Structures are given as C-alpha cells and as structure tokens.
C-alpha cells in the first residue's frame, strides 16, 4: 500500500529529525565563541587571465596547483599557467556549450560537458600534439553540470537527469548510476580519500554517496534553494554547500545535520561557487553580485569583500597548496588573489 | 624572460590571434536559438529554413553565416543552463497558429516564450516569430471560436483578426521593449523565403547592436 509506505517514510523522517535533535547538545558557535576571531582578510588581484572571448563557466586547478583549466561558451577550453600568465591550450569544442570542466589529478586529462549531454574527455598529451576528444560518453539524458575525475579512467558526472553517474571511460558505459536526487545534480565534491563523494542537486539536498558500494549514506536537507556548489572540509567530516538563496549551510557528517548558516542582509545574490582553504578557516563564495564575499567558517561573519570582477563569479577555486585563490567570472577574466 | 617563456608567450599571443580570427568569422557567423514546444512546427520551420541533447545546424546565406541551435532535447528545469544562451544574438520562437484549442498547448507555448523573453538573462536578445502550420489555422478559424483560448476575445472568427490578436497577446509577454524588437513572419508552412527573413532580421539586429555599441542608439 502506498499509504502505509508513505506513513513509514514519514515516521523515518521523524526518527531522523528526533535523532539529530537528540544529538544537538550544543552548537559550533558556542564552542568557537571563546577564541580569537579571524578578523579581516585582504587579498588583491595579482593577475588577470585574459583571452576567453566568452564568459568562463567552470574552472579547476591541478595537483601542482599551478595549471588552470577554464571553460567558456566560445567553444574553447583554455588551460592557463597561473604564475606566468599564458594560454596553454585552446580546445575547440564540438559543442560550444560547456558548463563543467574537470582537470584530472594526474593532469593528463580534461573534461567538458553541457547541453550536448556528453562528457567530452580529451587526452591533452596527444601523440599528434593538438588536443582531440578521447571519449564522448553518451549515457546521460541531461546536461552535465559537474564532473570530477577520480582516476584517469573513472569520472563521476553530475548530470541533469536527476542522477550522478560513475563512468568507465575506456568502456564508455556507466559502471554505476547514483540515484536518489529528486532534482538534477549541479555540483559534486570528492572526499580527499576518494571514497565517498557528495552531490549537491537542485532538490535543496546534498547526498553523501559511497562510490564503491553504490548507494547514498546520509542526506542533508537544510537549504531553501538549490545547491550549486559543494566543498568538503579539508578533514572531510563536514562540508559547506552554496545555494541561490545567498546562504551557505555547513553540514557535519557525523551529526548529519546543519551546523551554521552564512548569510547577511546585504548579500542577496545567490552563491555560484563554494571554496574552503587548506585549513578550512575561511569560506569563500562567488555570487551574482559580481563579487567574491568570503566568510569565516568558525564564526558567522563576513571576513572579506574581495571584488575585482565586473560580472558574476561563476567558478571559484582554491589551489591544493592553499597559496592562492582563483575567481573565474563572466567578465571573461580569471583573477588570482593573495 | 626565458626562451621557453618567450616561446610560450608567443604561442599565447598567437592563440589569441587565432581566437581573434575566430571572432572575426563569428562577426558574420550569427548565433540563432530555436525555441519550440512539443510539435510546434519546429521541424517544419527548420526544414524550410534549411532550404536528444541539442541539434546544431551550420550554414550561410549571402556571405552571412548562421549557426542555429535546437534545444528540444535535455528536458530539465532550464534555470541552470539557460545562461549559456547569453551569447546568442538571435532567438526564433516557433508555434502553430491553430494550437489554441487542443491540450492548451498555446498556454505552454506562451509560457516558455514569457520565460525566455522576460528572463533575467535574455533582456538584450531579440525575437523572431516564425509561425508554422498556417493553413490548418486558416481552415479551422471559421470552424471553432477563439474565445475558448482567450475569455477576453470579442473579435470575429477570421484568420487575419485572430492572428493579429494572438500576435498582440504574444508580444505583450515582453516588458523590456527597448533593447530588443520582435520581428514577425507569417508562414503558410510552404514558403522558401524563411532564410531570407532570417538574413534581413539578423542584419537588422547587427545594425542595432552596432549602433548601441557606438552609443548612438
């Protein structure tokens, strides 16, 4: 009976709410109140990456925390050398519409994805010398909102088909489809150990999946708006998810509940990207206000008004070494901050 | 700098030069986006103008290249990828004039036209109103009245007046009328001049955008 199963689901929701509340003895603000605040953070524009004829949609770093891949609607996927501003590559896409770009940790591969419903994957280190597609994954009935390489062969694709997919690139099929997101998944974040990845979908709920086993482990529904970008804590037992409601809500895995919300009366433009630091003390976010307002993770206050971009900061990222912060925007420029 | 740095900087400037020539070609290569509902004459209009995911169609006409983009596939919320169509410099909406009574598909057609034209991203992209299946509407207008489609209708069951009323309602869905202008071309689904209409309308849009960029308009 649908009625009894629905009642059981409601009872399980009541049980999870009761358990979460019963485990909520004190908040993180209580613990962090008796410590010295971060204060004010001042980072300037150290260089601007010019050359994209169209607005940059996705940005990713590499393991060496030097190279930078940027995706634009001009049909070009351009890789940059951050320290010495230089366009490494200009990949002419088969479909000019790209929303996600992922630089593999090995640095040998890049990904795009968009309205073509296909994860175009390029072996940059082509024996020819140019850049050509190595595989065109065609199993997703929707746009590819976010992809993230696990290995050179495994890619997790957050798609518009309300499901994430783990792909075998050489095989071409989906080795595992992650179902459970009632809304199309916009962003996914990987744990450092690459064992459990979260997926922030449009259902105002990020889900913690087990890559190998194949099902979701915990669910977190605190947002009033869809999750556009999610980032694990450096430790990995928590994460911050950004929404279009201009509020970032930090969730702790072990308590599987909300921890803190980073919102203010001045900030109404929705968060387009979420970034932590190498220590997690600072919560960066890019909004539609063409600005990068950055928050203190421990204490709810805005510890920076970083702004150097004329248009919306669509893609925001922090290097693996934590030295710098990249802010890709729709003004066709990527700018680093220090 | 170093010889590698010098050579890489040169390759950067010359990749920039290649992108500059690509943008030169895209100065005459105009991006069109087709917006049609389920079976709204979109196939007929793409066929006439020729003479899932997305469908890309590249061509040219009197030294004016066109890249038409069909987005019928990828059914989603459309609020998370529509911003990819910021760079499109032409929009062609598609429908059928007789689609005012079956289930109402005119309601959904006007609905996504409103979501497109009155979009917080598409406040500066202009409209071409390609209509199809005009012969069925012409035959059927005298048969059944349009008052079921619009309760505020007092006109006669004539194809001219019904078409004019539907076009007034369709145009009223736009509120920012300064940056964009709606062209109209009533097609009886057999015309071969649709590509010529696209040429003239796109040239008009190029002229208007250039005037605005010159600060004159």
């Amino acid at each position, epitope marked *: 009976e649908l009625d009894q199963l629905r009642q059981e689901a409601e009872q399980l929701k009541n049980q999870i709410r009761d358990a979460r509340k019963a485990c909520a003895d004190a908040t993180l603000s209580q613990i962090t109140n008796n410590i010295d605040p971060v204060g004010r953070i001042q980072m300037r524009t150290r260089r601007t990456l010019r050359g994209h004829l169209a607005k940059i949609y996705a940005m990713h770093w590499g393991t060496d925390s030097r190279l930078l891949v940027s995706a634009s609607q001009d049909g070009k996927l351009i890789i940059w050398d951050s320290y*010495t501003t230089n366009k490494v590559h200009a990949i002419p896409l088969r479909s000019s519409w790209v929303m996600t770009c992922a630089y593999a940790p090995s640095g040998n591969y890049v990904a795009c994805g968009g309205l073509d419903n296909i994860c175009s994957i390029y072996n940059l280190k082509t024996r020819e010398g140019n850049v050509r597609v190595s595989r065109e994954l065609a199993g997703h009935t929707g746009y590819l909102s976010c992809c993230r390489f696990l290995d050179d062969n495994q890619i997790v694709t957050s798609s518009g088909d309300t499901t994430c997919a783990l792909w075998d690139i050489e095989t071409g099929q989906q080795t595992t489809t992650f179902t459970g997101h009632t809304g199309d998944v916009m962003s996914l974040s990987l744990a450092p150990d690459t064992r459990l990845f979260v997926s922030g979908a449009c259902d105002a709920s990020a889900k913690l999946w087990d890559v190998r086993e194949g099902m979701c482990r915990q669910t977190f529904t605190g947002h009033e708006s869809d999750i556009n970008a999610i980032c694990f804590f450096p430790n990995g037992n928590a994460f911050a998810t950004g929404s279009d409601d201009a509020t970032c809500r930090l969730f702790d895995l072990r308590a599987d509940q909300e921890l803190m919300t980073y919102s203010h009366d001045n900030i109404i433009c929705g968060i387009t990207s979420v970034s932590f630091s190498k220590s997690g003390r600072l919560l960066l976010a890019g909004y539609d206000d063409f600005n990068c307002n950055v928050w203190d993770a421990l204490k709810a206050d805005r510890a920076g008004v970083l702004a150097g971009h004329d248009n919306r900061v669509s893609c925001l990222g922090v290097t693996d070494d934590g030295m710098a912060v990249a802010t890709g925007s729709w003004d066709s420029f990527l700018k680093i901050w220090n | 700098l*170093s010889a590698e740095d010098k050579a890489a900087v*040169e390759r950067s400037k010359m990749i920039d030069r290649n992108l500059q020539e690509d943008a030169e070609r895209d100065a005459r290569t105009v991006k069109l986006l087709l917006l049609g509902a389920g079976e709204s004459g979109k196939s007929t209009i793409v066929k006439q103008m020729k003479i899932t995911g997305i469908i890309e169609t590249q061509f040219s006409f009197k030294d004016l290249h066109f890249r038409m983009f069909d987005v019928g596939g990828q059914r989603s919320e459309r609020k998370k990828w529509i911003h990819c169509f910021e760079g499109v410099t032409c929009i062609i909406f598609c429908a059928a004039l007789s689609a005012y009574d079956m289930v109402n598909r005119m309601h959904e057609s006007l609905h996504l036209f409103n979501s497109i034209c009155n979009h917080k991203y598409f406040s500066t992209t202009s409209i071409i109103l390609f209509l199809n299946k005009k012969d069925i509407f012409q035959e059927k207008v005298t048969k059944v009245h349009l008052s079921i489609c619009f309760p505020e209708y007092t006109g006669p069951n004539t194809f001219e007046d019904a078409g004019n009323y539907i076009k007034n309602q369709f145009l009223d869905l736009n509120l920012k009328k300064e940056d964009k202008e709606i062209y109209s071309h009533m097609t009886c689904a057999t015309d071969t001049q649709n590509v010529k209409f696209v040429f003239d309308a796109v040239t008009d849009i190029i002229i208007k955008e250039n005037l605005k960029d010159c600060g004159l308009f």
Partner: single-chain antibody
Amino acid sequence: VQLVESGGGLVQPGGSRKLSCSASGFAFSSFGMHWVRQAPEKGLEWVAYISSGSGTIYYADTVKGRFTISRDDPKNTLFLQMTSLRSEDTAMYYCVRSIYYYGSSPFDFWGQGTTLTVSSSDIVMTQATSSVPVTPGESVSISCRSSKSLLHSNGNTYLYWFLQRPGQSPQLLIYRMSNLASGVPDRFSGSGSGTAFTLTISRLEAEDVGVYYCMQHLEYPLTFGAGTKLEL
C-alpha cells in the same frame, strides 16, 4: 602523426635549395616548429625556429639572414627556403615538432629528416661524460652542467634530454630537467642542483641505446651538448 620532408641532394654552394616539410597527423597551424641540423658525422645544433605560422623567426649566428624559413598552414607544410649554402651547412635537417606551453613537451617528435649536402654569449653546456658503457639492469645518472644557471623567476629549470637512436630521429625524454615526456618509460626521472643536472635512468634495456643530448631553453640561441653515447 608524421613529419615527412623534402629537399636534399647535391646542391652547389652559394645556391638556393628549399626544403618543404609537410605534416599529416596533427595541427600544423596551432603547434610551433623548428629546424635542427645534424651533420653526417657530427652532433645536432639548432638552425632556425618558426612559430605555428611564422610569428617570430630566430636564426643561429651561422645562418642569420642567410636563410628564410616559412610555412603554409593551409597546406600543412613547412618551407625552409635556404640561400647561399656553404661547407658547414651540409647537415640532416629535422623539422622539429615543437610546442610551447607550461609543462609542454617540445621536440617530442622529430621527423624522418632529409639530408642536405653541399659540394665543396650563448649558454654553452658540457657533456664531459663523453662515452659511458651502460649495462642492462643498472641505474644511470648522467650529467650536463650549464654555463649559466638554468633557473628563472618562475623557477622552471629549462633543460631537456633527447634520445637519438641509430637510423631514427630524436625523441624527448626529460623536459624542463625534471618532468617525463609522454611515451617514455617511467624508469627516467630528472633532478638537478641548478648547474649539475643528473638524468636518472634505472634498469636500462636495448630501447635506450643511442646518444643523449642536453638542451636548454633560456636564451633562444639554444645549445646542445656533444651527446654521450649509451652502448652496452
């Protein structure tokens, strides 16, 4: 990917022999190119450089203004229009597959070559190893000191390593003195202290036989070492 060429043959000194190198397999117009000579019984020295479409052309002191090298990007062919040949110009020219970005692998592919024969303040680098008997299954660290420190503000040490097998063309082994080129076995690695530059190779096989050239990329009048031959 191929780098076939033209030209060659007995050309009188003082004349004008044009070498055309056409490539089928990769993007000629978006990937730079070079010209490195090699005498029949001598080493290899860089002759001229052409950007991916002749942006800036650089010459050696012995070919400065004397040559005129260009290319046809639509024709996928690289043209070496060379004038006023001499006795020291007879050398086997490689239209080098050279690309230039960060972590790039320039000089990755060298073409089959076309030997051209004629009728009768640089960063000098040292390859004092000369001849070394390499035994299979043994780790080899081979050195090439630089006259000028190869470090830079960006910190990249511009030293290269190339493998010249008998009858074949050089292929890049180690680029930027530390990184490993694609298609090279992982038994090669690169490390250096700024001047003394050690190329670490472990458990060598017959595929490594040949000579090893250390190339810098600081000041564009590039230098190559004499080339230490590695034979069992």
